[PDB]
Write a protein that binds this DNA or RNA. Sequence first.
RNA 1: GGGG
DNA 2: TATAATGGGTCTGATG
DNA 3: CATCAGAGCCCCAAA
Lengths: 53, 83, 176, 1111
Amino acid sequence: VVGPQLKLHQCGLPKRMALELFKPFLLKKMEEKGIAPNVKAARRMLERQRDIK
Amino acid sequence: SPVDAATQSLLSEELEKALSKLSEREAMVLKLRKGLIDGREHTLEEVGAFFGVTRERIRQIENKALRKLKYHESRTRKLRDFL
Amino acid sequence: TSVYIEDVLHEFSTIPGVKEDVVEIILNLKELVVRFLNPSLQTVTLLLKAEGPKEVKARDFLPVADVEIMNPDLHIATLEEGGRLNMEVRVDRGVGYVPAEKHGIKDRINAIPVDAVFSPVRRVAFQVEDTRLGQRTDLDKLTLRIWTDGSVTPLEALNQAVEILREHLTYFSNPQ
Amino acid sequence: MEIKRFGRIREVIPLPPLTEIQVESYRRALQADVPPEKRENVGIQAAFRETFPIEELVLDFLEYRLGEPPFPQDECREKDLTYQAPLYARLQLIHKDTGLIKEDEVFLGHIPLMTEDGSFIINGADRVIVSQIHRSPGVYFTPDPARPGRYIASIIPLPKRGPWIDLEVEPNGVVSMKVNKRKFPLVLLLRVLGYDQETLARELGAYGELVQGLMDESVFAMRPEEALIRLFTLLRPGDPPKRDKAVAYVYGLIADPRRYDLGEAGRYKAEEKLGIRLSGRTLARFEDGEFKDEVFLPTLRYLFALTAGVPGHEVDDIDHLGNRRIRTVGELMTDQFRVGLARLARGVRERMLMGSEDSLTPAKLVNSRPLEAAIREFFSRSQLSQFKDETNPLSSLRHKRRISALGPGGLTRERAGFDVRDVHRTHYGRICPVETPEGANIGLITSLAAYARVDELGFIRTPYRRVVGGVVTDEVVYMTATEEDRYTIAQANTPLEGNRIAAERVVARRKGEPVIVSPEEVEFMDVSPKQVFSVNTNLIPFLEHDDANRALMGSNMQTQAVPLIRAQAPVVMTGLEERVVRDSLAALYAEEDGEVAKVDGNRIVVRYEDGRLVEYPLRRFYRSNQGTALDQRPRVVVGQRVRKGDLLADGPASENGFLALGQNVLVAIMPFDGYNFEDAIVISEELLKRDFYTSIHIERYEIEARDTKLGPERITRDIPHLSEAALRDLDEEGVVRIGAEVKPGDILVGRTSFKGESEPTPEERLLRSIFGEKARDVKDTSLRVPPGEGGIVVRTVRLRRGDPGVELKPGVREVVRVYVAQKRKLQVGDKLANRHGNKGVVAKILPVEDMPHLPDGTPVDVILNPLGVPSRMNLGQILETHLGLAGYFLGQRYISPIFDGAKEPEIKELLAQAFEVYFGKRKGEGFGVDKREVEVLRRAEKLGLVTPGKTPEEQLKELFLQGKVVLYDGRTGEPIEGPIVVGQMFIMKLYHMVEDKMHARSTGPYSLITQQPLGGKAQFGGQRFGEMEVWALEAYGAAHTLQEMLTLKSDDIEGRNAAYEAIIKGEDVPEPSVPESFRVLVKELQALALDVQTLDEKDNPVDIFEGLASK
RNA sequence: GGGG
DNA sequence: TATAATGGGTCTGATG
DNA sequence: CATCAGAGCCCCAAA
C-alpha cells in the first residue's frame, strides 16, 4: 500500500509481521526488561493472541 | 527444530546447575535411577552394587537430593515453564 | 453497543418466525437514536418482548426512566404467527466511532458486540456569503447548518464544539 | 424506484438458458428420463452399442437403467460423498455353441449426476466440467510450407479414436501417405481396396502429371491380398505377414468402428467437403469378402484437383469456427465411459476362455472396477474437472460457460502458439473477444457468447434475423461459422422504420469483413449487440467507450466480487443483471400464482392457486468453495399476492432480483495527497460505519482421531499441562462451544496422542521427578487456530465410528469439523474494482471530517485518481459517473444497453434536471451563492469551462452539465481550486483481502530431504529466495547477507540452530557451516558412481561429513 | 486454475 | 505337483 | 538429415 508520508529510507511494517519476523529478538528483550521472566515463558505468552500484552 | 535444540540445550544447562548444589554421589544416584548414564532406570537394587548401600540408604540418598533440589526451586524458579 | 437475544448464540443466527436475520436486526438496531435526560447516566439496558403477527417498531421497547426513543417508528423486525422476539440492548454514551471489534461489550455470555456510531451529528455544512458594514466591503457572513439525530440538539452541539475548541486553544499556554 | 432505460434496438429472441451448454449436454448423454426402447444411439447408449457384443461364448447388451441417488444433494456435500446414481445393465450370455442363455442385471457402479444449475458434487465439493475446444474431425487441405506449390491432405478423427493420416505428394509425382510417423507410396494401399489401373484413369483421369504419375507398375502386379501382405510388413518390422494377422490389424486400424471413429460431425464435414455419402463413421469397411473403400479416393481426387485451378477446391482455415468444435460435458464424460467399458470388455474376454465354458452367468463374468475407476478418474483428476468457482452467483455462471483449448485431447501450454489464441473473424457472435485471461493462458481459455448455442455436432451457432428485400422478419436462424459466410449480414443498429430497413446505406459483413452495402443486398441482420460478447462483458455499462485491455479486467473481476451484506445492484446497468440472477439459481421464484402463507428467516410457504401448500426452505449461510457466505434472504411478507415467476428470496450478491456484486458509492475523481498514488484508493470512514463493503466469510477446520500402534487418539477435554483459561470455551467432550469467539492460539478441538520411545528422555525424567508430577502418557495435539485466523464458531460436526449411518476411512475413529465465521469490514489492503478495469488497494481510510465534501455538507465516499484514466483509456467509468451524478439527486437507476445506451445529450438532459434539485432547493432555503464557489468559478472561467458574463447559477449549471462540481477540502474549508468530477460509481470488493495474504515466519517446518523451509502460508512456510533474488544480493555485493540466506536462514542445520540460540541470548549470530542441501548433492552424486571431493589448497581431501560417512 |  | 495347453497389446538450435 | 535439450519470477487454494 502507498505510504506518501514515509521518508525515502522507510517502510510501513505491520506490527503482526514484525512480531514473528523478529521473534527471537523480542524474546531476549522481554527477558531483559522483565515482561516475562525467562525466554521460554515469553514464547508461551506470544502463542495465544489474547495473552499478548 | 531450532526452538527445540534451544530448549534442550537450556534444560541441560539449568540442570547441571543442580549437580553442583547437591554433591558428587547424590547427583549420581539420580543419574542411575532416572537413566542419565545408561538410558535405562536402575532400581535401588542394582544401584546398591555401585556404592555398597542397600535399598533404603539409596532411598534417603535419592530423597535427600530431590527434597534439596525442591528447595532450590521456588528460589530460582527456572524449571517451572520447562514442560 | 451490545445485544442479547433469547436462544441466540452469535450474530450469524436466525430466529423462527422473524423475517429478518440477526445481522439485519443488529443493523436495524444500530440506527436507534436514544436520548438521555439525566446527564450523569452513562449506561442503560432497553428491554423488548413481542409475539404473534406484530411488526415490531422502536416503540415496543419497555419505557425506561430518563430515556426517550427519538425515532419510535423505526422498523425492527417482521414477525409472523408463532414468531417470538425478546432481547436486551445495551445503549452507551460515548464519542466518535468504536467498532465492535474494539469494545467487545458483553452483558451476558451470548451477548453480541455491536458497532457504535456515538456522534449525534448527522450532517454539517456552512455557507460563507458576501456582506458589508456599508463602510467596508468583502466581509463574510457565516451560516453554520447543523443537522442532528435529536439526542443532542444542533445548538448544544455548536456550544460543545466551541467549548472543545476554546479548551484546545488553552493548551498553547505553558511553553517549554 | 424509477428505472429509466435507454436504447432503440428491439431484441426479439432473448438469451437462451445460460447453463444449457452443461445441462443439455449431460441430459442428452445419459437419457435417464427416456424409456430405453425410445433411446437414440448417442452418449451412454452409443458407448454400450460400441463395446458390445463381446466375441470370445457371446455376451450381449440389452439396455441400461439409472437408479435414484443414494443421498440428496445436501447430504452429499455434508458427508463428503459423490452425488451419483446406480448404473445397471441387463446382459445375456448366449452360448454360440449350444444356445444356452443366462440373463441377469449387473451392477456397474455409480455415475455422478449433474445438479439443477449444471454443476457436480464430487466428494462433497462442487465441481464444473469446462467445455473443451478442439480441431473438428474431417478432411483438411493445408498448404505445404516447405514446398509452396504442393499441398497436404489430412484426415483427422475424434481424439484417441483413430490416427492422423497425411497424404504428402513427395518430390517425385506419385502421392505418399504418412501414418503413425511411417511413410510409403499410397499406391500400395489403393491396390488393397481392389483398385485396377483402369479405375484410376477412369475415375481420376485429367492430370497426366498426377493421374498417371501415381500409377506405378511394380505395385499393380499383385492381387488385393498380395499387396495387403506387402504393406503389413512395411509397418510392423517383426510380425509375420499372416493373412489373418494383417486383416486383423489393418481392419482395426482403419475400418473398425471400435478403434477408429470419425465423429458424427466428422462424417458430415467429410461428406460435404468431398460431395459424397459416407456409410459409416470410418475410412473403410469389410464387405462381402474384402475391403471396400469410402474416403481414400474422394480425398485423393480432391487433393489432385487442387494442384490445378479447379473450382470448389480451396484450402481450409483450421482456426475457422466451422472447423473447430466444442466438446461439452456429455461428450467429455462419455469418452471416459467408453474407455472404462473397453477395459471391462478386456476382462470379460479373459474370463470367457478360462473358467468353465458353460458354468458362467453374466454376474460373475463382469467386474465393474475398470469402469468405476475411469469414471471416478475423469471427475477427480481431469484437467477439465475444476473446483467450482462460486465466489458469487456470477462466478459459477461464468465458470460453466467457459471454453478451454487445453487438457486431454487438446493442446498444452508449451504446445500452443499464436494461431490458436488469436480472435478469429468467426468468433463474432460465438466466442466473446474480451473474456480471456491475462498471461500465459491468453486466448486458450474463453467464454461462450451470450446468444450462442452449441449444436448436436458441437459447432457454435449464433442467431441472425432474416432480411427479405428490405423487410426484417422476426424469424431467427442460428448459423455455423460456415453457413454465416454465405450471406451479407447487416449490423444490429441499422435504422428501422418498423420492420423496414430505413437507411440508404447499411453497415454489413461479408465473410467477417466490413462492407458498406445497400438494403437491397441485405440477407440477414444481427439480433443484438449482446450476441457478440460474453456474459460478464455484457455487464459493463458504456462498454463502447472502453479500451479492450481494460474491459477484459472488468469482465474477470466481476467473477471475484465478494458478496456483501448490504450489496446493491449498480445505478447504471446494462439489462442483464436480472437474467443472471435468474439463471444462476441463487434466488428463489414462484412456480405458479398464489398467495404467500408464512415467511421466516429459515423458510417461506406459498399457498398456490392449486390448493397445494409448498414450502421452500432457504439456503441459510452456507460456506462456498471459496468461503464466501451463500445466503438466501426472504423478499415477501405474510399474505402477499405473488404471480408466476415472482421473486420470493434474494440470493447472495442479489438485490430484489438484480445482480449486486458491490456497492454504489459517491466518488470524487481527484489526486489526494499521495494516498491516491499509482492506483491506490482512498475511502471515507463512513463506509465502515454503515457496514458498506462488509462481507461474511466462513472457514472450516477439520480434525481426525485415528487408531495408532501406540494407542488411540482421543477427542477429550483433559489436555495435559494446561490451564482452565485455555479450555474455557470447550464443551464436555472437548469441542469449542457454538458461539464462542476464537482467536489465534485458541483450542478448537482437544486431542491427545501417546508418545513413542520418546518416552521421556532422562533429563526430562529427572525434571519431572523433581517437580512432583510424573510424565504423562499422552501429549497435547489439539486443533488450534492458525496465525491470522479467527472468528465466531457457528457449527460443529462430529462423525464417529460406531454411530449410525457413518463409516470412516480405515483406521480413523472420529472426525470433527468446526466452522468459524468472521464478519469482514473493509480495511487497508483490501482490493476494490469497478466494471471498467479500474482496480486498486485501499491505501488510506480518512475520518469523515477529512473527506472532500460538497457545499451542502455531503462528504464523498471514494477518492479515485485521474491519472488512472488517460493511459488505460477506459472512459466508460467517466460516463458511468456522470449519469451516476444525475441519479443521485433525481433518485434514479438507469438501464443503458451496451452499444445502444444513453448518449451524451441524453445524459446532459438528466444532469440539468438534477441541477435543479441540487441548487434549486438552496436558493429558496435562504442561501445564495458561496464566496468560495465564486472563487472557483473565477478559475473555471480561466479554464474555458464556463461562459464569461453569466450569473453564478448559469455558470454552476454549466459545470454540472460537464459533471464537475464545487468541492471543499474538509481539512481547510477552502475549495479545491478547480471543479472536480463527482458522481456515483459501482465498485466491488474483490476476493483478494490482506487478511488472507499477510504472512510472516521466524522459524518453522523444514522439508524432509533438503532441510529447507516448507513453502506456503498454510504450512507456515518461508519465502522463496530464488535465483533472481540471489543475483540481486550479488549485484549489491552483499556477501554476508547472501551467505546468511544460503545457510543460517535455511538449511545450515548446525548454524541455523546456533543462530537462534545466539539471538535469544543476545550474542551476535555465529559464522555458518555447510548447508545440508549440499551434502544431499554430494550423496546424490555418489549414488551416480561419481566421486565428489572437497579439497584444501594442498589438494588434501576435506571431510564435510565430520567423520560420520567413513569407516 | 487465480494474483502481481 | 500330471487331460492339454508353446511369439504382446510446438519450436528452435546445436551436433554426428 | 536424426536426436537431444532448452523453453521468466514469486505467491495463493486445491489435493
